[PDB]
Amino acid sequence: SHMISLIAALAVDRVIGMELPADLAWFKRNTLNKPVIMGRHTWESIGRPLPGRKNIILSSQPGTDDRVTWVKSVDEAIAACGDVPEIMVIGGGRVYEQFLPKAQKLYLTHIDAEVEGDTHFPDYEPDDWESVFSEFHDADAQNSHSYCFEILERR
Ligand SMILES: CC[C@H]1N=C(N)N=C(N)N1c1ccc(Cl)cc1
Structure with missing residues (x-):
């Protein structure tokens, strides 16, 4: 059905x-x-x-x-994606802004880390996004910061 999704990693x-x-x-x-x-x-x-x-x-x-x-x-x-169930938009702050209005699913990784930069993920007002999945992880030997996966669906 050509669902567009966004997958991103965000710091604070x-x-x-x-x-x-x-x-x-x-x-x-x-x-x-x-x-x-x-x-x-x-x-x-x-x-x-x-x-x-x-x-x-x-x-x-x-x-x-x-x-x-x-x-x-x-x-x-x-159109270049063809007849696929889901299209994954993976990157560019600018690319995320251009595709958020056309997206129904969000795949976010919340990382517990300070990062200095002005490339920000687009504001998605909670009014028309529902959170359906949520998974926290402590930091371990391989992963230096705690992090939390989240999936949101457009209401
Ligand atoms: C660690 C980042 C990776 N992880 C998730 N979950 N989503 C993304 N968008 N990632 C990504 C970021 C930049 C580039 Cl160039 C490619 C992939």
Whole structure:
């Protein structure tokens, strides 16, 4: 039904960034075999296509890599995903803002960490978002901060 979802990691103040193992497993299991959409910035920091996913890059500037699909438009990106149940929007503060109005599902990782930056996740007023899932984790040997997975559905 071409549900668009957003998956993000947030620190306090909704601060986001590009460059915690458990969050990588969570990210990987919720995007596996789903087409993913991202900004230049986000593409540039991974370097590799994400395996077994249609990688789609949203940018005004022209393409530099044939392994991934390039688009200049929110609607060009959605159409490039084709007939799939769920589209995963994975990154760009700017890309998250462009796709929140078209999204029904949110996959958030709340990390108990201070981070200095002005890249913030978009305000999602609680009025029309319902929280359906919630999972806290202490810090352990592999994960340096406590963190909490959350999934919200649009009311
Ligand atoms: C640790 C971040 C990772 N984790 C979740 N849960 N969601 C994301 N959006 N992540 C992500 C962030 C930036 C880039 Cl470039 C790629 C992936």
